Amino acid sequence: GPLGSEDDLYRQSLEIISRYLREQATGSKDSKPLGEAGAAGRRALETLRRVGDGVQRNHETAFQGMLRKLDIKNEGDVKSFSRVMVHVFKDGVTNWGRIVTLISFGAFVAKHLKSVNQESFIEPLAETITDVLVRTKRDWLVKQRGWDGFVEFFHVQDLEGG
């Protein structure tokens, strides 16, 4: 049925986004590792976790001004996320770092939404951030084998080049 000409990545992009945003919102480290998303999720949830911890420390100024400018009240405030969706890739040249900031913002905003006890809008929050993530950078995701590519860019563990 679903399997065919539909979207295979989206399924994953969601599996990992949920897994990531869920572990972030709670703040507690997940004990159960990946086992459905495949290879991407395994190295993604761990990579994204690290890049996120850094992104937040690197954007604390931006993140503070971005979320402060917004104000999640209902599922309608998600429109504000759409604004940052574009503002994230403001630069003509597309870089994984930019896409990392997008996932980094909503991920940080999700944990923020949970800090105020509004998980109600969180469920749709994650569903949107993901949709808008793979659906906004689909062409790229298709031109860069999506998920696998993301990790291809971050195939570095304890090594640094440039």
- Listed by start position, the domains of the chain span 7-154
Query: What was the experiment behind these coordinates?
Result: NMR
| Integer Cα distance of 71 and 153 in angstroms | 33
Residue 149, burial from CB neighbour count under 10 angstroms (0-12, 13-18, 19+):
middle
Are residues 9 and 135 in contact, defined by beta-carbon separation less than 8 angstroms? no
- Domain 7-154, CATH among 1.10.10.10, 3.40.980.10, 2.40.10.340, 1.10.437.10: 1.10.437.10
Please give the structure tokens belonging to residue 53: 């911890």
Q: Which residues contact residue 154 at a Cβ distance below 8 angstroms, ignoring those fewer than 6 apart?
A: 43, 47, 51, 96
Amino acid code (one letter) for 28: S
